[PDB]
Design brief:
The chain has 13 helices and nine strands. With 472 residues, it is mostly helical. The chain has one domain: Alpha/alpha barrel (Glycosyltransferase). It has a three-stranded antiparallel beta sheet with strand order 3-4-5. Strands 1-2 form a two-stranded antiparallel sheet. It has a two-stranded antiparallel sheet with strand order 6-7. The longest helix has 24 residues. The structure holds a molecule of 9 linked components (NAG-NAG-BMA-MAN-MAN-MAN-MAN-MAN-...), a molecule of 5 linked components (NAG-NAG-BMA-MAN-MAN), a molecule of 3 linked components (GLC-GLC-RY7) and alpha-D-mannopyranose (10 copies). It is an enzyme of class 3 (hydrolase). This is Glucoamylase. It catalyses: Hydrolysis of terminal (1->4)-linked alpha-D-glucose residues successively from non-reducing ends of the chains with release of beta-D-glucose.
């Protein structure tokens, strides 16, 4: 259809736009140092001309996955990013130094200097996201015979971030939206993932991560507290409803293609994540004029949380895309398992799309399965069509689009918007990321403990990169 063709062209635009926003040769961000991912080229109203640890880590993980799938030209970009982080980790900033909390700093200036003004800090998701981005590249290096680069450059950088996560996971901080000082779902979810794949990577390079091992099960134990019985609470210490796309992002960014529909890790197809999907998406149905007249079986424009007032509270391209991505992931999981189960917890999600839905197990050859997957795919594509409808004529994607008229607003050419388009398109095409080991990390301890483990910190100096030749 036109969505299919639009997506193919948009994937090309998205890749180009991301590169334009990375220093020091990116066309839109002159001034940014080598390997520095800039959030948006907007220098004023709003000023997003900074580098955030979260946006950078999410964008680089996307590029690493494209690279591993054959986009070999991205090699230099990834190397520059890793080199830049060896420096950033050691930059003294308002959150502290390398070994005293500095790794939790949310953003830095594009020239690698500290941002010293007031900001919601620290944001503890950053080190976890950066670790996940680097581990993926480290895995490729190991697999392709560049052991020294993996052991001497990547591992030591990752070791710093993993130590930060194990030491401070059980402390409050700001959420991914940089507004709530408390304990956040997305953050705890990505931290659990990071420690698990961090331990595997440490073993692979001939080292160890005892703090990853002792803390991962405890983070998972705590993660269970976020389930309210009807949806996933986005944050503790908040007065809001708790319905927030923060939870959809937590699910899609911790999606493991080898995982079943596991409730303990909130996988995309788990009953808990499906129930949550409907609760979150439904919260935007009556608050945006853009959604007027749409039925419960139709996709709608999705924002961050219903109480949002940032730029008056509007839908976000990356949030609308996350709503579609969780469903593409679920379709993949059901297909791989050869069945789909409907439980009392997820019944409402299914009933809204297929009125004949009833609890039970449906094999992939059954009529019910066929009806449900068709309806889910159409629903998911619906979210992507809304994005297509409001993207600029040349493919530009801003941070937000107007709740009433759909015009683009806030930061223009937002790097994260482009990465979210790339991942949603990939999942739609059944292109999935490497597994992180969820199948051996979904067991919940019988008793949760408020605890931590201190790892180790050491400054890394990147002398040089071996002449890596990527072909495939
Ligand atoms: C698809 O097509 C679109 C349309 O062409 C493409 O988007 C355009 O892309 C160009 C870049 O190629 C952007 O140019 C920059 O513009 C800003 C100014 O932007 C503001 O003003 C614009 C014009 O307003 C006037 O005209 C319009 C239309 O007639 C009218 O509506 C308005 O009322 C007014 O009369 C606005 O259009 C623009 O709006 C957009 O952005 C908003 C905020 O993000 C957003 O909310 C809106 O929805 C809208 O999207 C906005 O209000 C210039 O400041 C900027 O200039 C810098 O960069 C150029 C090089 O690109 C350089 O020559 C300049 O010297 C300057 O350099 C500084 O900034 C750079 C980073 O941006 C940095 O690298 C430099 O080192 C330097 O930085 C230093 O100085 C700054 C000083 O503040 C400091 O902060 C730094 O720290 C540092 O010291 C560009 O000229 C267009 O804005 C943009 N247009 C739109 C509509 O988005 C799109 O890219 C295409 N997509 C694809 C995939 O191809
Ligand atoms: C450090 O780790 C320890 C160990 O894991 C953490 O301790 C656990 O903390 C959770 C969260 O506080 C706690 O769960 C609460 O248990 C209470 C009963 O024992 C519940 O009454 C409480 O209810 C809230 O959460 C429900 C979902 O579980 C919601 O349905 C309900 O509406 C409540 O949420 C509202 O109220 C809270 C107030 O707590 C508010 O913050 C929310 O925004 C919302 O308005 C919880 O279920 C566990 O009992 C604790 N476990 C142990 C062993 O002590 C500790 O929190 C961690 N600290 C940090 C900073 O990470
Ligand atoms: C770029 C972010 O801009 C906003 O965040 C600022 C906000 O404007 C400030 O007012 C202040 O917010 C404080 C509240 O005023 C106060 O009531 C209480 O909530 O504490 C907060 C924090 O001190 O600081 C924050 C920054 O911490 C906006 O609200 C954020 O959502 C914006 N973040 C987005 C952009 C960024 C880069 O692309 C993304 O990483 C992030 O996920 C986005 O949400
Ligand atoms: C998640 O991982 C646990 C082990 O930690 C398994 O028991 C479970 O079945 C799922 O694979
Ligand atoms: C599954 O595994 C976890 C550790 O990963 C245990 O804590 C739990 O008790 C169960 O054996
Ligand atoms: C947190 O608590 C655990 C036990 O609950 C310890 O093993 C750890 O050293 C830290 O004190
Ligand atoms: C993490 O925090 C615990 C306290 O909960 C300490 O015991 C540990 O040494 C580390 O600092
Ligand atoms: C936690 O504690 C260890 C020692 O117990 C330190 O090496 C680490 O830097 C952090 O302070
Ligand atoms: C923690 O452990 C690392 C790795 O052994 C040391 O290099 C560091 O100095 C600290 O003692
Ligand atoms: C801690 O570890 C780093 C990484 O190997 C070294 O660069 C530093 O000198 C210290 O031994
Ligand atoms: C590790 O940290 C030191 C400062 O302690 C820096 O000089 C180095 O560049 C790296 O960031
Ligand atoms: C990397 O190594 C250099 C020395 O070669 C240190 O100065 C730096 O702090 C980091 O340990
Ligand atoms: C690259 O190699 C030099 C060799 O002298 C080290 O000093 C530096 O710390 C980095 O590992």
């Amino acid at each position: 259809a036109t969505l299919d063709s639009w997506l193919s062209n948009e994937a090309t635009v998205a890749r180009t736009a991301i590169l334009n926003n990375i220093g020091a040769d990116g066309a839109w961000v002159s001034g940014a140092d080598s390997g520095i991912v800039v959030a948006s080229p907007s220098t004023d109203n709003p000023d997003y001309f900074y580098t955030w640890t979260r946006d950078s880590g999410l964008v680089i993980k996307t590029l690493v996955d494209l690279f591993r799938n054959g986009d070999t030209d991205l090699l230099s970009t990834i190397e520059h990013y890793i080199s830049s982080q060896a420096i950033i980790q050691g930059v003294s900033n308002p959150s502290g130094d390398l070994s005293s909390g500095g790794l939790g700093e949310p953003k830095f200036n594009v020239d690698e200097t500290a941002y010293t003004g007031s900001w919601g800090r620290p944001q503890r998701d950053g080190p976890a996201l950066r670790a996940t981005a680097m581990i993926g590249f480290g895995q490729w290096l190991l697999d392709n015979g560049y052991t020294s680069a993996a052991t001497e450059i990547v591992w030591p950088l990752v070791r710093n971030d993993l130590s930060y996560v194990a030491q401070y996971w059980n402390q409050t901080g700001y959420d991914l939206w940089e507004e709530v000082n408390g304990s956040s779902f997305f953050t705890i979810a990505v931290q659990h993932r990071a420690l698990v794949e961090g331990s595997a990577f440490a073993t692979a390079v001939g080292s160890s991560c005892s703090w990853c091992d002792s803390q991962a099960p405890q983070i998972l134990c705590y993660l269970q507290s976020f389930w309210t019985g009807s949806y996933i609470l986005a944050n503790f210490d908040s007065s809001r409803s708790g319905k927030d796309t923060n939870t959809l992002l937590g699910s899609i960014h911790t999606f493991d293609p080898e995982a079943g529909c596991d409730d303990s890790t909130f996988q995309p197809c788990s009953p808990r994540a499906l129930a949550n999907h409907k609760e979150v998406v439904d919260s935007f149905r009556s608050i945006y004029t853009l959604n007027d007249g749409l039925s419960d079986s139709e996709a709608v424009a999705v924002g961050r949380y219903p109480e949002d007032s940032y730029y008056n509270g509007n839908p976000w391209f990356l949030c609308t895309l996350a709503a579609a991505e969780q469903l593409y992931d679920a379709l993949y999981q059901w297909d791989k398992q050869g069945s789909l189960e409907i439980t009392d917890v997820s019944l409402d999600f299914f009933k809204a799309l297929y009125s004949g839905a009833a609890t039970g197990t449906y094999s992939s050859s059954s009529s019910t399965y066929s009806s449900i997957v068709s309806a889910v795919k159409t629903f998911a594509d619906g979210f992507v069509s809304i994005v297509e409808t409001h993207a600029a004529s040349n493919g530009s994607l801003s941070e937000q689009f107007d709740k009433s008229d759909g015009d683009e607003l806030s930061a223009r050419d937002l790097t994260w918007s482009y990465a979210a388009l790339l991942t949603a398109n990939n999942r739609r095409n059944s292109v999935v990321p490497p597994s992180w080991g969820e199948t051996s990390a979904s067991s919940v301890p019988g008793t949760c403990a408020a605890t931590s483990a201190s790892g180790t910190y050491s400054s890394v100096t990147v002398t040089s990169w071996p002449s890596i030749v990527a072909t495939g």
